[PDB]
Paper text:
We sought to determine whether this excess could be attributed to expulsion of residual ordered solvent water molecules from the protein binding pocket. We, therefore, solved the structure in the presence of an alternative cryoprotectant, paratone-N, which does not bind in the binding pocket of the protein. The structure revealed the presence of four ordered solvent water molecules in the apo structure. By assuming that a given water molecule in contact with each solute occupies an area of about 9 Å2, they concluded that the increase in heat capacity on solvation of hydrophobic groups amounts to about 13 J mol−1 K−1 per water molecule. These data suggest that the contribution to ΔCpb from loss of ordered water molecules from the protein-binding pocket is at most about −50 J mol−1 K−1, since the crystal structures of the rMUP–alcohol complexes also contain between one and three ordered water molecules. There exists the formal possibility that disordered water molecules within the binding pocket might also contribute to the thermodynamic binding signature. However, previous molecular dynamics simulations on uncomplexed rMUP suggested that on average only 3.5 water molecules are present in the binding pocket, which is in good agreement with the X-ray data. In the case of rMUP, the entropic contribution that would normally be expected to arise from protein desolvation is not present. Instead, the favourable enthalpic contribution that arises from solute–solute dispersion interactions, which also indirectly arises from solvation (or desolvation in this case), becomes the dominant term.
Numbering used by the authors: 1 to 157
The structure:
Amino acid sequence: EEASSTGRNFNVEKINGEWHTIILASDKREKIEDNGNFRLFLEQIHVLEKSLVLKFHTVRDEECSELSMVADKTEKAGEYSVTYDGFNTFTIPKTDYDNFLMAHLINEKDGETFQLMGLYGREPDLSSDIKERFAQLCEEHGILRENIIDLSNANRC
Ligand code: NA
Ligand code: NA
Ligand code: NA
Ligand code: NA
Ligand code: NA
């Protein structure tokens, strides 16, 4: 089955566990480029009662650095917030739990904003079909394909 974090039949426990950053996308491309703060390689999600604990690494000159953050439930079901390089809110518009997870995030920093979209896989890669479904979801949010970066060959340390 497939679900959205904002949908009535969402089962948050089913996103617990291993994940990998497959593709990232943004209407501010710099954020996810080589040295951007949002070029974040997911490793794990730990589902807690009213939060998610997100385990990431970043890469600078081919060296991995670990970082964790805690995303808290907001007043709206399926939305989470987290402070990281500004104030962030996010939802999971589509996941099948067992293969892929698609996130949509709004960042706000210094009075500005941008959108980030992420495609996460249980394995270090996903099928071209899923990758295409992600590109479609990006289009629905006004993010061009040229702003979509497949990171499936640089998601390892
Ligand atoms: Na810049
Ligand atoms: Na949306
Ligand atoms: Na959204
Ligand atoms: Na592969
Ligand atoms: Na569409």
